[PDB]
C-alpha cells in the first residue's frame, strides 16, 4: 500500500512506494496530489503498466488531454504522448528527441494543465534524466529590483520556435507551415507571475523555449533584454547546468514521474551518442485552472 | 535543319523547327541565343531527348549549374532539376509542384544564370503552361513617378518564403530549418534595375516570390509599400492573370522552352484537379553575368 517518502525540508521531490493505481483509495490520490503540489516531483516506484493502464493512472489524477498534434499520439491510446527514436515494426511511433529546451508543458496554449506524468519505457544508459527548475523558488531568489521591474507585466508565449515538422509538411514551402502554426496556435498572453492556486506561491511563468515577449500592464512592449535577464537569473541560459536552481532528476526502470506543471519548467538531456530512448507522457487537468485568472 | 520563326514585332516568343542539339552548328547556337535575348522565349519543337541528351543540349548554350538543394536533382543527371508528382518505382523523383509563385530563377543567389530550359515530360490536360512577365517591358511601362522613386535603389532577395521542406527535416524544430536557410542562402542585394548585358534594355529585377525589401543608395530601408506598388503595377498581384503584362505560354509534347532568365519572371499554373505533371529543367550561365556589375 502507498507510502510517500518526502525529501526533507525544502529539498525537491518525493519517492512513492507501493502505489497501484487500480486499487489506490481516494485519500491516497489526494495525498499524492498534495505531495505533487508541495514537493513538485513525485517518483512512483516499481510501475509496470500497459499503455491503457498508464492512462487509467492519469485519469485517477484528473482529466487527461491529448496533445493537439496527432503525430505525437500513441497509436492505441490517443491521450499518450510518445517521445521515441525506436521504430516499432519499422514505423516511427511518436516523435524523436522531444522537449530539448526549457519549457512548461502547454505554456503556449490558452489553458495549460496542472500535472504532467512521464513513464520512461526505454532508458538510455548515459545522459539519463530530465532537468527541472522550480520557478516559484526561482522567483523568490530574484534580485528585488528584477521583481519590481516585472511587477504587473504580461508575457506572450508561442510554440513557434520549437514546432516540429510533420511528415505531410515535406515539399511544402516553409512560410506556409509558419503561417499554419500562427493560425492554429497564436501566441497567448499570461501575467508574468501568478499565484499558484493550490499552494499560494508566486510563480514566475516564463521559459526560454516558449516565452517570446514581455509587455507592461498598458500593453506596451518592453525590450526583450528584460526576458534575457530573467532567463539568465533563473538558470535557463547556463549551458553547463551547474546553476543553483537546476535540479537533475534521474530515474530507473519502473519509475514514473509526476510533477507540478504550474511551478516547474523542464528540459530533456542531450545525448552525445545515439542511444534508444522512449518515454510515454500523459497530461491532466486538475481541479483548478493554471491560475485563478483563467 | 534549324529554322527560327519569330513572333512579329514586339510580340513575345519564337518557334524553332528542325533543331537537333547534336548536329547544330556554332552559328545555329549563336542565332538561337540571339533569339532568346530578343524574343525572350524560344520554343524548340519536336524534341525527343533522354536526360543525358537534354543536358548536352543545355551544354551547347553555356555552362549548366546544378540546383544547390540535392532533392531536386535527377537521380542520373545531377544538373537536371526535376519538378514531378509522378513516383518512379514508388520513389519521389524531384519535388512536386515547384515554382507556384512569381520569380526569376536563382534571383536569391549571388550569381544568377542567364538562360533557363524547361523540357516538359508529362503534361497536364487542364491548367497547362507557364505565366511570364517581361520585366524590361514592365519597367518601360511604369508610371514615370515610380521610375524616379526607384532610381538608385537596391533590392534584397531571399528564398526564405518558398524554401521547401526536405525529407530529413521531418521532426526537426522549424526554427532550426529557418536558421539553416539564412545561413546557407542569406539574402542577396542587387540594384533594383540593371542594364541587360546582351540587349542594353533596362530590367526591373524584382519578384513577389523572392524580393523581400528595397533600400536607397545610402542603404536606408524604404517602406515595403514601395515594393507592393511595384508588384501591383507590373501585374504580379493580379490573381486573375488578366493583366496586360502577363503572357501565358502553353506547350505540347516535344516542346522545349528556353528563355531569358534576366528579363523574365515566371510562375507555374495552379491545377484545381490532381493531374500528373513532370518537367525537367537545366539552367546555364552564358557569356556574361546577370549584369555587368557582378
Ligand atoms: C513542442 C513540445 C513538443 C516537442 O518538443 O516536440 N510541446 C510540449 O511538449 C508541450 O506539451 O507543451
Ligand atoms: C524555390 C525554387 C524551387 C521551388 O519552387 O521548389 N527555386 C527556383 O526554382 C530557382 O531556381 O531559383
Ligand atoms: Fe515537456
Ligand atoms: Fe523557376
Q: Mind explaining what this structure looks like?
A:
2 copies of one chain form a homodimer. Helices cover 20% and strands 24% of the residues of chain A. By secondary structure, chain A is of the alpha+beta class. Chain A has one domain (1-294). In chain A, the strands form 4 sheets. In chain A, strands 1, 2, 3, 4, 5, 6, 14 and 16 form an 8-stranded mixed sheet that branches. In chain A, strands 13-7-15 form a 3-stranded antiparallel sheet. A 3-stranded antiparallel sheet of chain A has the order 9-8-12, with no helix packed on it. In chain A, α1 links the parallel β2 (14-17) and β3 (41-44). The longest helix of chain A is centred in the first third of the chain and has 14 residues, at 26-39. The two termini of chain A are 37 Å apart. Bound molecules: the ligand C[C@H](CC(=O)O)N[C@H](O)C(=O)O (2 copies) and fe (ii) ion (2 copies). One copy of the ligand C[C@H](CC(=O)O)N[C@H](O)C(=O)O is lined by residues 95, 98-99, 105-106, 159, 162, 164 of chain B. It is classed as oxidoreductase.
Summarize the structure.
The first copy, chain A, is α+β, with helices and mostly antiparallel strands and 294 residues long. The first copy, chain A, contains 6 helices and 16 strands. At the A-B interface, α5 of A face α5 of B.
Measured as a percent range, the helix fraction of chain A is 10-25%
Q: State the secondary-structure class of chain A.
A: alpha+beta
Assembly state: homodimer
| Beta fraction of chain A | 15-25%
| N to C succession of SSEs of chain A | EEHEHEEEEHHEHEEEEHEEEE
Main beta-sheet strand count, sense and barrel state of chain A = 8 strands, mixed
Q: Largest contact between protein chains? A: A-B, 22 and 22 residues
Bound molecules: the ligand C[C@H](CC(=O)O)N[C@H](O)C(=O)O, fe (ii) ion
